[PDB]
């Protein structure tokens, strides 16, 4: 069922960071487009584009950090311990969630909640 | 390469309708016109395919879709008129009361 | 215009006439058919009268309701008569009159 | 817009459509590599499911 | 054949040129009326009626009685619409 | 205090009501009352359908299914 | 071209192929039994294999030049 | 080449429909997109549809749009917005739709590449079809009112609804 | 020749009766002699009679609706599935009409054209059910949609009604254009629009490596249009705004009949055509999104109409779970869920229309209703517990299936979503029971008693809701019949 791949832990981490950046760029574009423009900005176009691109870059960065650290810690767990399970990975989701989303939200309870949610989500898979 | 060129003509009109929706969040009249551009592109698709397949069903449906497009435009502009008459303006900030 | 009366589900009763003419189906109207016709028409006239009192048009409303009922009752009676002649409905009397004439 | 602006946008669109013609010819020229790659991926799946049922 | 449309195009170009010569030689020396919407709607409906008549009129010799009566039913529906519009005062401009 | 009216409440009825009230508040704000947002949502759904159910043949080279769902849930902890 | 009505007032170019495929499928309880007729109909619709073969010829001509 | 000219005219005219500041100009550019479509239909040999697109889209529908838009006297402030910020989202959406749909036929309808050989000599002519040829008009009229008459009548019902709804929504009798 | 039209007798009758009513209304509403009488209730009673006569003609002519099936084949297809679907649609329309007379008389909504447009849309949905070709399907869908656009804007001086109509026209025309683009792709790729031809072309292959992308995207776009029609997330945001902004009898009608007709279309198009997995995954993912989003958004609502709109979105999610599984029991359960949701919604909107005489708007307006009208508070509590799926009320039946398919098609994430969203739904439904029974407000609203039509309809639907699980055999048998008749 899974016998179509070539793997490579470093390649896995790089590709995951790249995919995370792409998804974060798409998400940032969507969020920037949903929002209205500040009233002081309705009559001038360029600052709106700058804010859209800034949102794109910031979301690409945070999503790339999550999508990289998740699999990086997943392999660095399954490499040293060298056991394949859903446990290996629950730790990666937790550390990605905690670190990145707590650096972003600046809150420790938010870090714990985000890591827990990512842990359950990666556990189901 | 004839079929691909006619097809891309119609496809560009369809994409222009989509972009016109995307680009006119303050202009609801242009949104209605973008929808009419999409409908025109679909009609073209049916006619081109009818020719390409030597089949008449694409032409029958093109005529009927014409009737539908006319009816849609008449009703759409009637609703636009009563919306404007009630509010005095067409600005999108006056048609956002229903929410949640 | 090419036509084909053939139904998806075959008639379960003796087929007296596959495609009976309009006047033949009308002439096949039975006592029960006229009872259905009259009941539908009378109910429709009554509804027209009763719903017309408040706007003040009970007479014209009566005529309108009666027209709707006349069309619906005639269509229902025709439906039953033609179904009997075609074998789709139980058609004892149709077969008894057919086996004799 | 100015009339010259409409003319210039038309020229640019004409160039875009000729570029699309080149893209279509490129896609038409690579039908055989698509077919040969598809030969492999479908046959790999066959040799695969056949081997997976030998046990 | 579509060959006969090419002279129409060349004719259009020449008409354009004549228009510009005539127009250019001298450069050398808040109240919405719903009745216009209503007339537009009526025109659109009957425009579609003329459109559906064009194939019918050229095809009458093949469609025979079936085609005639289907067009009559079509007209009957649209004429009921017309009578509705008439009784509602959409045809009055005073 | 620490268990019955503490952690059990927080990891139970008291916390569950809080988080679901915030989730309901946020989901309600999506229905913004702007027709442009409804068309944008329809267009995004169309684009998402096309992308996932047709353009998902060569992506599996660079992506994994695990990452995808991870990022969707992680989007909830933004701003 | 499954309806039969051609755009110039005659039988459609691909109607006979459609009818062959349909008549085969009406009694063959397995769709794979009518695969050849199905791809005949679709080939009539789009001329994919014919044009692919002619493009092969053109490509070989360009290669030998 | 000719298809490239018509495609370019339609592309510019459509951009002007969706990007003009003034909605009256937008309706006028829409008339140009319909004229170009009529030209394409003439190329396909469908002269009835080419004329009907002129009669219905331009002669009747665009007129209604023009009457309504002109009498509305829309002010540019009520509908103005800067569109530079939408270049990325337009880019992604349009690029996905482009890469996926401008090339949807390519696998199914492979183009015949033009060679340096006269392939016109292999056109086979069948004269039997040419004895009494049918126009687009009579070919369509052979079907509309007999084999497919129910859809014709349903379209009449659609038109009736349009007339009723127009009267009911807007009529204020003097 | 005349006997061929026996297959279209119900439609012929209803269309001609609609014309008669249009003429009668316009002639006597303009009459100075009768002082321009309001004719909305008169034409309403005559139209209800017309619907009941149409129902008589259709149900008593079951074998005759299949006469001349080859002559009528290129236009429509009448079978047992269509027979029962059309009977149910006519019953829904009759109930909805009977629920409107108090609204006509007390608000003085005098426009009889309201009834005419409802009847014309009923014709359109009748043609939708028997549609057997993409062309006919689209035409019938457009007729129904245009009637709804016009009736959504019927209160033409109200800001809310004009706003509802405008959003409906734009989002509805957009979705219709998307669906029409899908039909064009399918036609171009297969040269066929008839459902039988599409069946033959597409069966046996699905995605056989060399998949026609044209067919696949035609299917995707048609599916997007259908999902807009059934208010599945993420194509749903038009529904709560239009449901609120439209006049309440319009909201009641839009809640039931279009769903019956569009689900008939979805069955006959997808279950019958053959692209397979992707089509069902579409509906699987949209069902999950609908359940979650409907539950949360309903939990956030403070107005009765919005709560009902979001509840309907959640329930279509539950129903579409049945279409996702793609088995005989899936179709049967979809049909059972549709029937029970329709009866429950008719109950709920009968109560809402009864309370609209004193202008109910907020959930808090129902405070102390168990004192001012105890039997109405019990009837409404029964409806809310039925909506929540508490056994042995009829609402349990649909909930039971959700978990039956989740453990049948082997899907435990679906099961978990169902458990959580069921709990959330139970909460926001029992909040209304708390408001009517447990609260002691300082200011009470006294409500006018309802008319006879709504009391009789409410009594019957409430008896059904409490007592269906005692004698559920006929619905089970008839839905099994319909599920089988989809293929044979």
UniProtKB/Swiss-Prot annotation, chain A:
It is found in: Plastid, Chloroplast outer membrane; Mitochondrion outer membrane; Mitochondrion inner membrane. GO terms for cellular component: chloroplast; chloroplast outer membrane; cytosol; mitochondrial outer membrane; mitochondrion; plastid outer membrane; pore complex; TIM22 mitochondrial import inner membrane insertion complex. The keyword Transferase does not apply. This is Outer envelope pore protein 16-3, chloroplastic/mitochondrial. GO terms for biological process: monoatomic ion transport; protein insertion into mitochondrial inner membrane. One of its GO terms (molecular function) is porin activity. Its main location: plastid. The chain crosses the membrane at residues 18-34, 56-73, 86-103. The chain holds residues 7 to 131 of 159 of the full protein. Homodimer and oligomers in membrane. Part of both the NADH-ubiquinone oxidoreductase complex I and of the TIM17:23 complex. Interacts with TIM23-2.
From Swiss-Prot, chain B:
InterPro entries: NADH_UbQ_OxRdtase_chain4L/K (IPR001133), NUOK/Mnh_C1-like (IPR039428). It is a multi-pass membrane protein. Pfam families: Oxidored_q2. The chain crosses the membrane at residues 3-23, 28-48, 62-82. It is found in: Mitochondrion membrane. One of its GO terms (molecular function) is NADH dehydrogenase (ubiquinone) activity. PANTHER family: NADH DEHYDROGENASE SUBUNIT 4L-RELATED, NADH-UBIQUINONE OXIDOREDUCTASE SUBUNIT ND4L. Belongs to the complex I subunit 4L family. Complex I is composed of at least 49 different subunits. This is NADH-ubiquinone oxidoreductase chain 4L. It comes from Arabidopsis thaliana. The gene is ND4L.
Curated annotation (Swiss-Prot), chain E:
The keyword tRNA-binding does not apply. Pfam families: Oxidored_q4. It is a multi-pass membrane protein. The chain crosses the membrane at residues 8-28, 38-58, 63-83. It catalyses: a ubiquinone + NADH + 5 H(+)(in) = a ubiquinol + NAD(+) + 4 H(+)(out). PANTHER family: NADH-UBIQUINONE OXIDOREDUCTASE CHAIN 3. HAMAP family: NDH1_NuoA. Core subunit of the mitochondrial membrane respiratory chain NADH dehydrogenase (Complex I) that is believed to belong to the minimal assembly required for catalysis. Complex I functions in the transfer of electrons from NADH to the respiratory chain. The immediate electron acceptor for the enzyme is believed to be ubiquinone. Belongs to the complex I subunit 3 family. This is NADH-ubiquinone oxidoreductase chain 3.
Curated annotation (Swiss-Prot), chain I:
GO terms for cellular component: mitochondrial inner membrane; plastid. It catalyses: a ubiquinone + NADH + 5 H(+)(in) = a ubiquinol + NAD(+) + 4 H(+)(out). One of its GO terms (biological process) is ATP synthesis coupled electron transport. GO terms for molecular function: NADH dehydrogenase (ubiquinone) activity. Keywords: Electron transport, Membrane, Mitochondrion, Mitochondrion inner membrane, NAD, Respiratory chain, Translocase, Transmembrane, Transmembrane helix, Transport, Ubiquinone. Its EC number is 7.1.1.2. InterPro entries: NADH-Q_OxRdtase_suN/2, ND/Mrp_TM. The chain crosses the membrane at residues 4-24, 45-65, 84-104, 111-131, 134-154, 168-188, 215-235, 252-272, 282-302, 308-328, 334-354, 375-395, 400-420, 456-476. It is found in: Mitochondrion inner membrane. Its main location: mitochondrion. It is a multi-pass membrane protein. Core subunit of the mitochondrial membrane respiratory chain NADH dehydrogenase (Complex I) that is believed to belong to the minimal assembly required for catalysis. Complex I functions in the transfer of electrons from NADH to the respiratory chain. The immediate electron acceptor for the enzyme is believed to be ubiquinone. Exons a and b (AtMg00285) and c, d and e (AtMg01320) are cis-spliced, while a trans-splicing reaction is required to link exons b and c. Complex I is composed of at least 49 different subunits. This is NADH-ubiquinone oxidoreductase chain 2. It comes from Arabidopsis thaliana.
